[PDB]
Design a binder for this molecule. Sequence first.
Ligand code: NXL
Ligand code: NXL
Lengths: 237, 235
Amino acid sequence: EWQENKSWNAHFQGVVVLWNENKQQGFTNNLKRANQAFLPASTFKIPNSLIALDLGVVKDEHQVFKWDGQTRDIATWNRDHNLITAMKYSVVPVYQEFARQIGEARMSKMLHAFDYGNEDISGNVDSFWLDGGIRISATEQISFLRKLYHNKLHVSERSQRIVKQAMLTEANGDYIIRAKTGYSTRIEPKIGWWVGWVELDDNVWFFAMNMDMPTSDGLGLRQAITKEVLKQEKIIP
Amino acid sequence: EWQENKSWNAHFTEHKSQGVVVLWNENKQQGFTNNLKRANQAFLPASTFKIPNSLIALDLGVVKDEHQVFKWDGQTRDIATWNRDHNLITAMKYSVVPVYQEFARQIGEARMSKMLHAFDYGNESFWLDGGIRISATEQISFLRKLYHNKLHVSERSQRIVKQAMLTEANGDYIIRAKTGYSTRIEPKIGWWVGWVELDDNVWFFAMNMDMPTSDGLGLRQAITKEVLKQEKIIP
Ligand SMILES: *C(=O)N1C[C@H](NOS(=O)(=O)O)CC[C@H]1C(N)=O
Ligand SMILES: *C(=O)N1C[C@H](NOS(=O)(=O)O)CC[C@H]1C(N)=O
């Protein structure tokens, strides 16, 4: 079952989707948007990373991808990266290289096995997640993460553990968050994503949210509105 | 290259205690401590032994994974959080001795001994009232092997124990570590060992300190972070 709970509309426009792993129930503020597919954008770094590691395009979390020297918009982009940092600073050029070397045939094969969204890579092999034909909703995101969480994707366990390490966002004595932000820019309607999960001592709560993002301004709200939902729901303090 | 820094003693002095922190700059392969002698004095590992113990239990299959549930034996102990079911993640977080005691009995003395020798861990419930001793400088040497997946256990066993050691993370650093409290033999001391991952570097640390009562326990982490701040490692 799924409860719709419109009170979180207050903290917003967009949708927040929770799955209670133990109880095996869901929660959202908009059943219908929860099922509306969008461009994944940088949340594509999760399955890109999984595929790059399983195929050995990436050796491990330590391998250095060296800055090509050309200076791009985001300053954190313009240095050397490994997988941990590339993922922290959402470094597109690193992941483009990954996509090229994966190739179009292996990429779609992998996406079909992951049952990822609409499973469709039309557009450029190095930007389809931004402006090609790929589409995934919040509930499709959760569904993918659930599998990632349990090591049941059709890639090695090792590859699964490394990406979840690279997904590390926050941890304290209350909870651990593993997640990835995204910001769909090239194609309407512009939207900001956050998806991942929060680990508790004796449960795990999966989450996917997106919201309208007409401006670069509101990016902080992806975390802040999701966290406000998590408190009202007393999942975190 | 080791460098002795007496200024850190004021972080100990400030709470009327004494102790050592040892720091290791992985990129530069340089160490730093406030007390060279105590750096290399060997103490009972106490709960920091949960590190090699966890590694060994996983590599052998005594623990199958971080979700395997170790149920409470129903005997009520005085850490309240121990009186519940646990997995590897929680048992490490709440430092749950009777789960780890089960691990050790199942590992057994032969296999334990030969695994610790392969780890080059310490000297040649023993971690708490008995035999094994290790120094803060040796904890770091052991942790560095772990960090690099260089121990004689599977890569997998090393990644699960590192996941289990996760203590703190934010946009500035990740800390993976383990606290300990040696209470049975003099001198009663507290420990915190582990490391800090930055974007560009990792800093390993190992600290111990006189701990006559459980009241100063918080100082293990606090004095350590006071030292990390002084050296511009965290904000
Ligand atoms: C991913 O969506 N992108 C890469 C980069 N980081 O976005 S994030 O803050 O959500 O991680 C900039 C936005 C976007 C892009 N323009 O490619
Ligand atoms: C380990 O040193 N111990 C188990 C438990 N944890 O304390 S910790 O926070 O220092 O790790 C209580 C004290 C100690 C013990 N007596 O075994």
